[PDB]
Point group: C3
Chain length 415, copies 3
C-alpha cells in the first residue's frame, strides 16, 4: 500500500516527522530567530513557488473553461444543473463565513470598504491589477494604492474575455488552442511542485511548532476549528439539502437518503468524489427512478464543479487564519472570502493535485500571512473524508431535482 498513491503517504510522513522534530526541538532551548528562519525557509520556498503560478492558472483556466461552454448541452438540463451548482456552492460558502464568525475559533467606515470592493472589481489598469489593489485612506479622503494581487478584478475581466470569446465561434480557434496549451503547461508545473511539497510542509510545521510560545493555546483553536467545520458540514448537508429538496420537488426527502446510502458510505470510504461514480450511478438510476438522460449529464459534471463541502471548508479556513493572526476582516474582505471560496471550490477538483494553490488564492485575495497554512494541513486528512460526503450528497440531490424540473420535456421527447 506504500507504493500505491505515493503523495498522501509522503505528506503524512512529512507532517509526522516535522511535528516530531519540532516537538523535540522546542524542548531544548529558547531558539535563536535566525536559525528558526533557516529551518522554516524551505516552506517559504514552497509558498513562493506555489504563489508564482496563481496568475497564469487563473488566466488560462477561465479562458479554457468559459469558451468550452455548449448551450446545446441537452437543452435546459444544462442550465438547470448550472443554476443548481452555482447556488448551493454560494449558500455553502455564506454558511461557512457565518459559522466561523459566530463560533469564533482562534482568539474606516463600512461604506468605504464596500466602495473599495466595487472599485477593485473594475481596475483602471490591467498590468497594475496583477500586483496592486486600491484602498481608501483618510485624513480629504483620497485613494491610495496598497500592495497585493487584485484577484477579483482579474477574474471579472477574464470572465468578460472568455464570454466574449465564446461568442465569436470558430473564428477564435487559434486563441483557445493557445490557451489550452498554456493550461496544460501550467498544470504540469503544478504537478511537479506538489511532488516537492512534502519537504516544505515538514519545514513549515517545524517552524510553526518551534515558535508557538504556548502549546495548549493552539491545540484548543485547532480543536474548535474542526468543530466548526463539522457543524458546518452537518448543518449544510443535513438541513439545507433536504430543505431545498422539499420546497422544489415536494417529495419526501428521507426516502431519498434511504436511496443514496451506499454512495454516502462509499464516499466516506474512498475519500474521493471522482472514484465514487459507479456506486452513485447504481444507487440513483436503480433505486430512485431517475432517468438515465439526467444522471449521465448531471453526475459527471457535478463530480467536477459541484464541490460544496470544499466551499464551506475554504470559507471557514481563511477567516480562521485571519482570526489567528489577530486581523479583523471588514465588510469588503468578507465578500471577497465568500466569492473566492466559491471560485476556488470549483477549481480544487477541476485541477489535479491543486489543493494547496486554492487556499493560497484566498489568502492572497484578502492579503493574509500564508505561513499559518501548515496548521491546516495537519488536520486535513481528518476532514476530507467528510468533505467528500457532502459533495456526493449535493450531487445526488441535484440529480434528484433536475429530473423533477424536467419531467415534461423528457415525456414529450419520449412521446
Amino acid at each position: 500500500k506504500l507504493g500505491k498513491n505515493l503523495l498522501l503517504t509522503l505528506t503524512v510522513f512529512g507532517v509526522i516527522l516535522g511535528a516530531v522534530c519540532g516537538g523535540l526541538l522546542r524542548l531544548a532551548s529558547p531558539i535563536h530567530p535566525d536559525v528558526v528562519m533557516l529551518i522554516a525557509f524551505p516552506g517559504d520556498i514552497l509558498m513562493r513557488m506555489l504563489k508564482m503560478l496563481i496568475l497564469p492558472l487563473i488566466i488560462s483556466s477561465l479562458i479554457t473553461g468559459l469558451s468550452g461552454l455548449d448551450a446545446k448541452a441537452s437543452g435546459r438540463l444544462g442550465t438547470r444543473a448550472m443554476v443548481y451548482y452555482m447556488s448551493t456552492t454560494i449558500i455553502a460558502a455564506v454558511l461557512g463565513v457565518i459559522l466561523v464568525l459566530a463560533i469564533h475559533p482562534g482568539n474606516v467606515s463600512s461604506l468605504d470598504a464596500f466602495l473599495d470592493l466595487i472599485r477593485n472589481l473594475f481596475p483602471e489598469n490591467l498590468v497594475q491589477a496583477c500586483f496592486q489593489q486600491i484602498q481608501t485612506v483618510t485624513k480629504k479622503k483620497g485613494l491610495e494604492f496598497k500592495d497585493g494581487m487584485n484577484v477579483l478584478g482579474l477574474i471579472g475581466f477574464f470572465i468578460a474575455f472568455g464570454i466574449a470569446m465564446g461568442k465569436m465561434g470558430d473564428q477564435a480557434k487559434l486563441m483557445v488552442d493557445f490557451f489550452n496549451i498554456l493550461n496544460e503547461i501550467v498544470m504540469k508545473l503544478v504537478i511537479m511542485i506538489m511532488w516537492y511539497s512534502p519537504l516544505g510542509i515538514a519545514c513549515l510545521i517545524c517552524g510553526k511548532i518551534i515558535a508557538i510560545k504556548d502549546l495548549e493555546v493552539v491545540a484548543r483553536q485547532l480543536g474548535m476549528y474542526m468543530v466548526t467545520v463539522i457543524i458546518g458540514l452537518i448543518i449544510h448537508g443535513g438541513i439545507f439539502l433536504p430543505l431545498i429538496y422539499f420546497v422544489v420537488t415536494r417529495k419526501n426527502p428521507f426516502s431519498f437518503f434511504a436511496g443514496i446510502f451506499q454512495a454516502w458510505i462509499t464516499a466516506l470510504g474512498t475519500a474521493s468524489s471522482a472514484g465514487t461514480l459507479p456506486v452513485t450511478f447504481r444507487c440513483l438510476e436503480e433505486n430512485l427512478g431517475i432517468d438515465k438522460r439526467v444522471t449521465r449529464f448531471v453526475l459527471p459534471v457535478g463530480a467536477t464543479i459541484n464541490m460544496d463541502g470544499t466551499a464551506l471548508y475554504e470559507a471557514v479556513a481563511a477567516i480562521f487564519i485571519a482570526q489567528m493572526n489577530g486581523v479583523v476582516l471588514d465588510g469588503g474582505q468578507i465578500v471577497t472570502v465568500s466569492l473566492t471560496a466559491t471560485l476556488a471550490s470549483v477549481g480544487a477538483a477541476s485541477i489535479p493535485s491543486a489543493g494547496l494553490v486554492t487556499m493560497l488564492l484566498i489568502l492572497t485575495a484578502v492579503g493574509l500571512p500564508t505561513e499559518d497554512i501548515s496548521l491546516l494541513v495537519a488536520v486535513d486528512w481528518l476532514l476530507d473524508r467528510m468533505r467528500t460526503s457532502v459533495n456526493v450528497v449535493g450531487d445526488s440531490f441535484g440529480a434528484g431535482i433536475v429530473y423533477h424540473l424536467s419531467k415534461s420535456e423528457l415525456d414529450t421527447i419520449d412521446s
Copy 2:
C-alpha cells in the same frame, strides 16, 4: 424614430435627466460630500471600465493595422494619400492647441520637460511602461518614477513591432491572426460598455452639477469652449484647406467648393462621414472631373483615417479640461496632447462606438482628472454635426489634390 439608433437618444435622455436631477438637487441644501460620492459613483465605475480597455486596444489595434499595409496599393496613390492624411491631421491638432492656449477658456525648466518627453518615448522596461512614467525631480537632479500610464512609449514600441512584423511577410501569419482575434474581442467589449454608458453619464453630470459652487461661472467657459471649437473649425477648413489646395494644384479653389456643396450639406445633415459616401462620390466624380481610379481609393480610406475635425476638437477639449482644473501644461505635455490627439482622431472613426475611450486616452496620456468629461458630453451633439463637415471637406480636398499629383502616371496607364 425612438427605436432607430437607440444609443444617441438614450445618451441625450440621460444627459437631460441628470441635469434635471442635479439642478433640482443643488436647490435643496448644501449636500454632504459622502452622498455626493454615492451619487457620482456609477460614473466612476464607467470611467474605470473604459480605462481598463485602453491598453489592449492600443496593443491589438497597432499590430492589426500596421501589418495590413500594402505597398502595392495602386502604387503612388497610396503614399500620396497617406502623406496628405498624416499632414492635415497634424496641422489641425497644432492649430487646436494654439487656439485653446490663446483664447484661454476656463480661468522645472522647459529643457528638463522636453528631455523627460524624449526619455518617455524610449522606456527602460515594458511592463513598467504600462503603468509608470519618468520625470525629473530636483533639489543633484536625479530621475524619479511618477505614476500614470506611459502612452507614447507603448505606441512607439508597438509601431516598431508592427512595422517589423509586416516585413516578415507570410511567416508571421499566426501572430496577426492572434492579434486579429484579440482585436475583435476587445471591440465587442467596447461595444457593451458603451451600452452601459447612458447611466454613467447621467450620474457624472448630476455629481458635477451638485458640486459646482457657482453656476454662471461654468456656463461661461462652456460657451467659450464652443466658441473656440467653432473658430478652430472655421479657420482650419475655410482658410487652411483652400490655401493647401492653392499652393499645390494652382487651380481656383472656389469652384471646388461650388462642386462639393451637396456633400457638405449632407454631412451637416446626417452627421456621419461614413453614410455620406454616395453623395460625395456623385459630387466629385461627376462635377469636378476627378478620375474614378482616384476617388475609389482616396474617399473610402479618408472616411476612416482622415478625421481632422476630431483632431482639432480633441486637442482643444483636453487642454480645456487642463485649464478648468487649474493645471498648467508644460512644454512636454503640449507635445503629448498634440501627438495623442493625432493618434486618437484616427482611432475615433476606425473603432465603432469608441468616442469616449479616445478622450480618456489623452486625459490619461497627460495625467488629468477624467471626471470633468461630463461637461463635454453635454455639448457634443451641438458640435459633431460640424466636425463631420470639416472631415468631409478634408476628404474632398484630398481627392482633389491626389488626382493633380498623379495626372501623368494615370495618363501613361491610359495610353
Copy 3:
C-alpha cells in the same frame, strides 16, 4: 575595405571621433553640467532602447531554444557535449570573478544576502518580477521590495516553462510557432538599434571624457583591466584546458596544440569563431584522428553555444564597472554575476549583432550604472581577437574529449 563590414568601422570611427571631441572639449573650460547632460543624452537614448528589449529577448529566446532540444541528437554525443559546454563556461566565469576580485582594478550579513538570492530565484508574482526585486532591510527584519528587474527569477521560470513545453511534443506546436515569430521580430529590432549605435557610443565616450576630473587615473584602471582579462584568458586556456584534457583522456596534450595550431592562428586572424570552421575541420579530422561523426556535431554547436572566453570577459567586465563606481558586491551579487555571465556568453554568439545587450543584461541583473560601459567599448577591439582564440581552443578540446568518451559506441556502430 571600408564598404565591407560597415559596422565595426563606423563603431571605431565613432569612438575615435568622440574621444577627439572629448579630449578637445575638456581642455576648454570647466563645463556646465546641463550641457554635459545634453552631450551625453544620445547615449542615454541608446541605453534605454537597448534595455527595452532584454525582457522579450529572454522570454522568446528561452522558449525557442529549450523546446528545440532533441534527445535523439546522435545519442550520448549530445549529452556529453552539453555537459562539457556547460562545465567549462562555468569554470571560466568563476575564474573571471576570482581574478577580478583579486587583481582589483579600479580603486547586512552574508547569510541574508544568500537568502535574498534564493528568494529572488522563486518570485511571488510574475508581473512584479519584470521590474522589482526583493531584499532584506533591518532595524524586526522584514522584507522590502527594491527596484530593478529580476533577471534570475524570470530565467528560472521560463526554463521551467520551456522544459515543460518541450515534453508536450506535437501538441504545443502553435505556441512554439508564436514564440519563433516573436523571436524573429525582436532580433530584427536588435539589428536596427545596433545600426543606430555608433552615434550613441560617441556621445557616451565624449560625456565620459568631459566629466572624468583626472585623466591618468582612468588610463591606469583601463590598463589593469586589459591585464586581468589577458591573465584570465592565458590561465584559463593554457592551464585549465590541457589539465581537463589530461585527467579525462590521459593523452599527451601538447601534440593536441601541435595539431590545432592553424585553427588558433586563423582565429587570431579573422577574429570570428563562425568563419573559422573550415580551418578547424581540416585541422582536427585530418591531423588528430577525430572521427567525422564527432566533429560534424560537436564543432557547429560549439561555435554557437560554447563561448568560454566571452564568459570570462563578461564576468570580469561587470565587477570592473562595479569597482569603478565604488560599489562593493556582496555574496548575493557575486553569484548573480557568475550565473548571468554564463547565460549571456551563450547568448552573445547565438543572437547576431547582440554584444551590447548581453553586458546590459548583467549590469541590470546586479543593478549597476550602465553609463560606464563606454570605457569598455574603447578597448573591445583589442580583446575580441583573443577572446575568439580561447573560444576556438575550447571547441577543439571538446571535440578531442567527446571522441575519447565515445570510442566504444562508435566501434560497435562500426562493427
